Amino acid sequence: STVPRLHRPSLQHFREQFLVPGRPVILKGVADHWPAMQKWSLEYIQEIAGARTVPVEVGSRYTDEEWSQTLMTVNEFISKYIVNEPRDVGYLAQHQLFDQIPELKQDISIPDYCSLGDGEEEEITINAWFGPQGTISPLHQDPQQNFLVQVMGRKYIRLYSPQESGALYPHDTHLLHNTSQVDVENPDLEKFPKFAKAPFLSCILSPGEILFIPVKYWHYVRALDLSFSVSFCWS
Ligand SMILES: O=C(O)CNC(=O)C(=O)O
Ligand SMILES: [Mn+2]
Numbered sequence: 352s353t354v355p356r357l358h359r360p361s362l363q364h365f366r367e368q369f370l371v372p373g374r375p376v377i378l379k380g381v382a383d384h385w386p387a388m389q390k391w392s393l394e395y396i397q398e399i400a401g402a403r404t405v406p407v408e409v410g411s412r413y414t415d416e417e418w419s420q421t422l423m424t425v426n427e428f429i430s431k432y433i434v435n436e437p438r439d440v441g442y443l444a445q446h447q448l449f450d451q452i453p454e455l456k457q458d459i460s461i462p463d464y465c466s467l468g469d470g471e472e473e474e475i476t477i478n479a480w481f482g483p484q485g486t487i488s489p490l491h492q493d494p495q496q497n498f499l500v501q502v503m504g505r506k507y508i509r510l511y512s513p514q515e516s517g518a519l520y521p522h523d524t525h526l527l528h529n530t531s532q533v534d535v536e537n538p539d540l541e542k543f544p545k546f547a548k549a550p551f552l553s554c555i556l557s558p559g560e561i562l563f564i565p566v567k568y569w570h571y572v573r574a575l576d577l578s579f580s581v582s583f584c585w586s
Contacts, residue, residue, distance in 0.1 A: 504578030
């Protein structure tokens with residue numbers, strides 16, 4: 352099935368129908384008037400952030416044995432992994448860019464829905480996810496609520512309830528236990544037969560849309576275009 356899309360639901364409606372039961376939804380009409388939606392382009396990103404050092408994940412998926420993490424400038428990242436026919440997949444993933452570069456923080460807004468949480472606003476973490484077409488974040492689950500805001504490009508996203516965890520074959524080690532052993536888009540059904548029948552939601556997340564990923568919901572993400580998303584991690 353597809354993730355439902357709602358236009359600016361009330362706080363109460365979001366709390367009662369999505370946050371408390373732990374059900375995904377796409378919020379429309381909320382982030383579409385972030386300044387980022389019209390300002391962020393490669394040129395603007397280079398102007399404001401190009402000289403700054405960022406961590407870059409290199410490799411198809413963080414579960415790959417070739418995968419590694421390095422450091423470079425934002426200008427270098429764009430040159431090597433976006434604009435010039437890249438040799439390998441690079442991803443400026445899970446980085447607190449807005450703490451590093453407060454000028455860019457002015458182009459976004461924390462969703463008012465986060466105030467329904469039991470945590471402090473000062474404890475919300477804001478992460479950038481910026482990369483070329485084809486980045487893949489393998490199926491995993493996170494320990495907080497998430498609003499994933501799409502600014503540039505589109506992402507294909509697959510969501511599996513925590514009720515389906517047994518069909519997702521989590522890694523057995525403590526370090527990887529919140530990551531699935533399965534490749535969502537080409538699963539080894541000989542090794543992982545229960546995966547095939549596990550129900551899920553999916554969507555293509557487009558610019559200006561916010562996906563609510565409930566705490567512990569399993570998610571898999573593939574960028575369909577040059578993409579920039581902003582996540583808000585909250586409780
Ligand atoms: O956007 C991606 O590639 C992956 N995102 C996440 O896992 C997240 O926001 O928690
Ligand atoms: Mn995640």
